[PDB]
Ligand binder design. Sequence first.
Ligand SMILES: *CC(=O)NCC1CCN(C(=O)C2(Nc3ccc(Cl)cc3)CC2)CC1
Ligand SMILES: *CC(=O)NCC1CCN(C(=O)C2(Nc3ccc(Cl)cc3)CC2)CC1
Ligand SMILES: [Mg+2]
Ligand SMILES: [Mg+2]
Ligand SMILES: [Mg+2]
Ligand SMILES: [Mg+2]
Ligand SMILES: [Mg+2]
Ligand SMILES: [Mg+2]
Lengths: 5, 5, 236, 236
Amino acid sequence: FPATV
Amino acid sequence: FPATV
Amino acid sequence: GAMGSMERASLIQKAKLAEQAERYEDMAAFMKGAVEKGEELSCEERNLLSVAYKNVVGGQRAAWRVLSSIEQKSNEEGSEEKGPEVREYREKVETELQGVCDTVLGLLDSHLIKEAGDAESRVFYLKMKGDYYRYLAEVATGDDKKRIIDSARSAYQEAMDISKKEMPPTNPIRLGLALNFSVFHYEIANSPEEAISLAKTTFDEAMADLHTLSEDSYKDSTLIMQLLRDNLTLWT
Amino acid sequence: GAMGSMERASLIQKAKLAEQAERYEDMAAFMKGAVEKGEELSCEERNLLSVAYKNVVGGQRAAWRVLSSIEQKSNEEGSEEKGPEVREYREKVETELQGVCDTVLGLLDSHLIKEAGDAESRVFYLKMKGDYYRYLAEVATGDDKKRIIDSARSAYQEAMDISKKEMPPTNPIRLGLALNFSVFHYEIANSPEEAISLAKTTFDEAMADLHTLSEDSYKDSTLIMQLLRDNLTLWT
Ligand SMILES: *CC(=O)NCC1CCN(C(=O)C2(Nc3ccc(Cl)cc3)CC2)CC1
Ligand SMILES: *CC(=O)NCC1CCN(C(=O)C2(Nc3ccc(Cl)cc3)CC2)CC1
Ligand SMILES: [Mg+2]
Ligand SMILES: [Mg+2]
Ligand SMILES: [Mg+2]
Ligand SMILES: [Mg+2]
Ligand SMILES: [Mg+2]
Ligand SMILES: [Mg+2]
């Protein structure tokens, strides 16, 4: 799963 | 803190 | 009884799904519903019940400790007055924790314990009763603190008496009971010598009975024996 | 409005305590109460709001993914029929997730966005709007899936347009918006090329502006740039 902020 | 189960 | 319309088997199935999803509040609610069907619990089911509530209350205890520490620091000399909010929020968490404990104790009293005749079930439930009174004792500061502590002690003692008569010294339930009662002595009853003696004797008597066990039983017993050792190491 | 009787400042204080205690549901409820006082939020307060709901919904998304995986496996050939329970429990978690998203979107619409005039506040809220529509899109399977996806896209696009006009390429809000909009492209809009282009261009334009920054601003910007790089590495 990709990084989000 | 000590171990409990 | 929000779970009153759900099949017992479906509640058990969902408790297992909730565990896999790390949804411990859901898991506990499902298991409460299952208990309230009124049938006795199997071993697997007792473990689902205990895991669910242990995780819920464990999180509440950790939060309570964070908040209590902040509160204690606020009451030191040279701490600036910040108003009632820290105490209020610690009280909120505390009340929620007490509610969970009361819920569990309620399930045990109505009617898990009284229907539990086999040593493995009866000791397991009495241990739980001791544990949830212990959690109440951790946060108790009033008129009833002594009675709460005694309620924990009494439950653990009954469990101990049965376990010593009816179970081998390596039985994981007997071991876990002893581990937790030892912690009760150390942390709640201001009896570190009793705590240490109990842990040591329990460990040594289990060690002497390992020879009777299968590989799989050996694994189960040695796991809890290591917890006894860990606590002894912390305390000595 | 269970928080209607509590002072704004007390809600903010308690949100901070809840964060320290890792009580993210409480933190979100406190921040909802603070928003509902009707005053604009400061930067620190916007971050408390976002952290609280990110943590709550993050946990729900992780649980939903576990349950959806189990459900998908149940629908494969040679899987034994286990009844409606997996779908029911996935639906329960899903409904709770949608409720949280709707709550956040509600705060943004009533009336955070319309009162936000400074670029840093407006972009931050529009990014949040994109994010919570994205979470709705992740679980959408019906008639409105396209409109939900478009709602996310529109919110992100408005935020992007403002950020490019009003903020330097290293601004952490501009970077985080681009990071998340890039993920939207990759995971939701079936546009991996757009995702990769956005991440790359954002990274490279930030790199070129690092020379203007203090040590502390450099730390903040490079942290998010590394997330852009991490995603590029995953995707290429
Ligand atoms: C029905 C039953 O036999 N339950 C006990 C098992 C024993 C093995 N076990 C463990 O070692 C762990 N949990 C506990 C829980 C309670 C007690 Cl009293 C002992 C051990 C996982 C440590 C799982 C439960
Ligand atoms: C009011 C304000 O300036 N908020 C943004 C800050 C920027 C720095 N920061 C971060 O790097 C982390 N969180 C976020 C959150 C949202 C966005 Cl758009 C970017 C970054 C912690 C990663 C904290 C919030
Ligand atoms: Mg039935
Ligand atoms: Mg109290
Ligand atoms: Mg004795
Ligand atoms: Mg006021
Ligand atoms: Mg649905
Ligand atoms: Mg573009």
